[PDB]
Amino acid sequence: VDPDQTLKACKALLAHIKKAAAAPRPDGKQNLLADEESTVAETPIWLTLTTKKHIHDSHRLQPGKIILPHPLNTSEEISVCLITADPQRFYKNAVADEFPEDLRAKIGRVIDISHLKAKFKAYEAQRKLFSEHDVFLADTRIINRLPKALGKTFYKTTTKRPIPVVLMAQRDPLENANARPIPEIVAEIRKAIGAALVHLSPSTNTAIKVGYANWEPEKLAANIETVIRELVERFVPQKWQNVRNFYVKGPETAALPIYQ
């Protein structure tokens, strides 16, 4: 792995997307809800690991969080949902009388697991929930339960799968809700939102979100380097024996390689 040639590709791919987006579209039409900067932004580029062995020969269906030095989803329009494994009113009161001001803004809807299976069992409702928020969290006490509850509409794609969040102490609902101290909760929510996410599938290609196309490239280069070093040492088996090509590519362009 070498950092400079990673940077000069990161210049080239990012500069391409401005040329692609700013180019007009030939049927004589414009877009009301798509500014030139808004589509230069909000277009994520992501790192596509290519392996030799099929990593984790099963469907893991639970994301792993790689702590990024500078966070991913900390924009101004992010709606986030916290699926909690205990009385909804305790967390509703927790996020109202606490959870600073930024976290109070991003908390869109906190929903109990029991209220989720009653109100969102149908496939209208789990499609309306998919399109309404942007990142979904989950308590670790209900991470296994969400495949049945939020089914294919939440788990066919890896863009929005519920992020595992630990919210326990170290049961009658109204009497007791085993949770962390409240400042330890809101601090941990901050980590989960802005973390690059790995998704283990019986596959050779793994797409990891690294950032959007409006950041400055050295910011991105420091971010991709931390994604590279964390993923090999922690997640893919046969750490550098099973490693193979590492491409970076945007949602509408070709793949820019790095090899290992």
Add this chain to the structure above:
Amino acid sequence: TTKVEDLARISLRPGPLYINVDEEKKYSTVEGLEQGYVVVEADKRFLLLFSFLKKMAKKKIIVFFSSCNSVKYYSELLQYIDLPVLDLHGKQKQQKRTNTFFEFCNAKSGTLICTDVAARGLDIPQVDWIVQFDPPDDPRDYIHRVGRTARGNNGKGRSLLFLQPCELGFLAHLKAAKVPVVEYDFPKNKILNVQSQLEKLISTNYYLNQSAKEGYRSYIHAYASHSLRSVFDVHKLDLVKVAKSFGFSTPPRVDITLGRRAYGSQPRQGGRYK
């Protein structure tokens, strides 16, 4: 016009007093204009307005409605829906009217709701958009005067008009006067579906229900009394869908309308028939 003085000879006394404070320098531009339009279904007109205003925040926005009652209802709804928007309607103080516009003319960003008859009496400042949500009162004055004021001297100001699918004869009338058009695409994903939140508010809040009912009726009633009935026809309006935009699941009742002579008969000649 010719009919005007015949109204004067029948109404006025033989000696009138003639006053002309008219603006004879009518700068009705014929070519230096470009009109925008968005074809939007009747049941997602508001959702496109809300998605427009939310994403085109940090800019200058002026919206034209057709009735002061719909301005009043949209003002109270947007405060509940949490979008800070300025307003200009007739149920306000005259002093509050002026301090609202002076605040808007000096502001950097912002968004103002007023009726189209309010802007005709008002001095439009430099703005980034002029959006005609409801149909205009007189289409000739909209295209010429409001198109040029949207262009707004130097700064790039663009004007758009909301059109239903049953309203595309406006394009034929625009083509007759030979004025350029551009239509915007607006993908269906970026619509903020707050329809469920809206209908929960209308069905539960009583003050918003009154404002919704009066805004819906005034919108239909202004539509009926429109001058150019070829394109703005109320009988080509699906009233269930237009009450969906206002926040109703059942459209409230409104009166949309508001050969052989007698055998052996002769014309009347006498009698005090009252």
